[PDB]
Amino acid sequence: TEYKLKLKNLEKRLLETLNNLKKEAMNIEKKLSESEEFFPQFDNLVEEYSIIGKHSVKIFSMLEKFGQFHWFYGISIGQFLSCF
């Protein structure tokens, strides 16, 4: 985001430095080319976390049903993350 904004700023400034223009353009191109294989390897990882999550939301729900049962057995989500 900051590179594309600064690139537009450099382009309007050049309208009213081509070396650093080309270098930041190459930097912009590289921080994309490396985003190509990063995403399918990123999102392929989390299946470990889906089995984590489906248990986590069930555990919190069970403690919540203990909280609706008796007024003393209350629990917040902040305490769940602190214990996590």
Q: Can you characterise this structure?
A:
- The dynein complex consists of at least two heavy chains and a number of intermediate and light chains. Interacts with DYN3.
- This is Dynein heavy chain, cytoplasmic.
- It is found in: Cytoplasm, Cytoskeleton.
- The structure is cut from a larger assembly and holds one chain.
- With 84 residues, the protein is mostly helical.
- The protein contains five helices and no strands.
- The protein has helices spanning 2-15, 18-36, 38-44, 47-69, 77-83.
- Helix 1 packs antiparallel against helix 2.
Keywords:
1 chains; mainly alpha; 0% strand; Dynein heavy chain, cytoplasmic; motor protein; AAA ATPase; ATPase inhibitor
Question: Could you give a quick summary of the protein structure above?
Answer:
The PDB classes it as motor protein. By secondary structure, this protein is mainly α. It has helices at residues 2-15, 18-36, 38-44, 47-69, 77-83.
Number of β-strand runs: 0
Measured by DSSP, the beta-strand proportion falls in under 5%
The helix-strand sequence is: HHHHH
C-alpha Rg (nearest Å): 25 Å
Number of helices: 5
The structure class reads mainly alpha
The major pleated sheet works out as: none
End-to-end Cα distance: 33 Å
Query: Overall 3D geometry?
Result: elongated
PDB class: motor protein
Keywords: AAA ATPase, ATPase inhibitor, Motor Protein
Entry title: Yeast dynein motor domain in the presence of a pyrazolo-pyrimidinone-based compound, Model 1
Name: Fusion protein of Dynein and Endolysin
Q: What's the helix and strand layout?
A:
Elements: H1 2-15, H2 18-36, H3 38-44, H4 47-69, H5 77-83
Helix pairs in contact: 1-2
Family: Belongs to the dynein heavy chain family.
Subunit structure: The dynein complex consists of at least two heavy chains and a number of intermediate and light chains. Interacts with DYN3.
Subcellular location: Cytoplasm, Cytoskeleton
